[PDB]
Amino acid sequence: ASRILLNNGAKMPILGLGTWKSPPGQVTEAVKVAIDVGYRHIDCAHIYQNENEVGVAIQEKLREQVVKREELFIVSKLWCTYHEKGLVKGACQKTLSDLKLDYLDLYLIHWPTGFKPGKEFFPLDESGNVVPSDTNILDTWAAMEELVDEGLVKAIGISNFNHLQVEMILNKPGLKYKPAVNQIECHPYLTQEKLIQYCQSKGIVVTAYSPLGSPDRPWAKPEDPSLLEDPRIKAIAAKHNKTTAQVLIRFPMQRNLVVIPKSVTPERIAENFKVFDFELSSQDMTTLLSYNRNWRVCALLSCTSHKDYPFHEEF
Template identity: 55%
Template sequence: MQEIPTVGLGTWKASPGEVTDAVKVAINLGYRHFDCAYLYHNESEVGLGIKEKIREGVVKREELFVVSKLWCTYHKKSLVKTACTNTLEALNLDYLDLYLIHWPMGFKPGEKDIPLDRSGKVIPSHTSFLDTWQAMENLVMEGLVKNIGVSNFNHEQLERLLNKPGLRVRPVTNQIECHPYLNQKNLIDFCHQRNVSVTAYRPLGGSRDGVHLMDDMVIRKIAKKHEKSPAQVFDFELTEKDMEELLSLDKNLRLATFPTTENHKDYPFHIEY
């Protein structure tokens, strides 16, 4: 397993017209970890930025760590390779450094990313993420991806996967929402005890119910003390007291709840962690 660069550029909600330039600027600034997904519908633009910087000689492909994710409508074993090759084509790459199952839930395949029934709830595909994982393992065997992992899995789902009979390739990471208002201590401890790394998404929080993490008085106080911005509080060493104060901010406030999928048998947030 190669080392995952600590900080990555997330490309969710990055507009197709802007993300190519964002990727180029990021590479110039030293970013080497890029987090993509089929669902973001901008992988071809991300690929353009990467291609240009490789062509300019600023970076080599092997210096980059490119991640993408299998979307829920491709959980059927027969569709996994198709999804992966489509992503590689869009990114204009020969392989991915890491490919994740975006959510543990499979949706009905088709043209809609989130197929809904008349009541506005998702239509499941009745697949099992354990079967999906088998097809993910095949991608490693075929050299299309170097590593595989999961995203938004709770501890029970991750345990089921790790205990799967005939497991050939272990998940290297679980990518989860994680920030001071949702510190995920229990899930992180669980992952680390099983030698699964954790990748945090939305580390700077966001907005829900008018709550803005970057406006939090504790974070602003710590930032001022270290002469940093609130966002930079997360990019250098803090004292133990600083860390205790940040951890005390936990409100179990989940921003990515995906409410249209609460009816799904594999919805991950019905349990505490």
């Protein structure tokens, strides 16, 4: 089955296309190809600074009558510099304008940390610390709720929230919408068992990002572990006559997760979608979960003093 039921009654495709680090010079082509081979879910963000070019590709394929808007599941995220309640609608509408859409299927608080408002996306002080804003999770969530009620977005959720942060929202007195999705890093080196169990037990759908271990993350170090190059995973893949990437994508699908692998290479975009024709065994699943090492590609150290830094907590 290709989609998962959200708590707003909408269905979300469990396989989507990631766009972080896709240059504007290629994401337009990536999205056109992805739509052509079956992708219906695109994961976007203002901070990826390519939303216009994603937009160009969606609009053209609608025009080309390849797909209808209702068939598409378009996701974007509120960046940290816009957590002030007065700044949220504006940030959402900028994304909508860039994407040439009149609604988003899902809009996420990108990170639980608010940053000092301004032009700069990562404001740092003279000594390299991120400059926080005096905003809090709940007031930001309230502002996300207004976007639903104004029809700009069909569902709202969070990303990179620990279970206590998620709980803050669930337990909010006067809560209008429960989060639909929590999008978190997840792969065989960071298996997220406790956070996944929590979220699923609250009927919050989990999206796994960086499922291939983000080998193009800009701060990669040669000594870092490399999922696509792990000979153990390569061995599972060889056994199924699939690539290592296909195995890494299928793995979260069998944990009832949504997964959003990124590529701008047309051959890989196609390859990555071809994962509904095979099953990983119970042993394969057990084996892949045993590789957990609590290793994160996304965890900017200049943020570790923010009051809302999410990764001090065990989960």
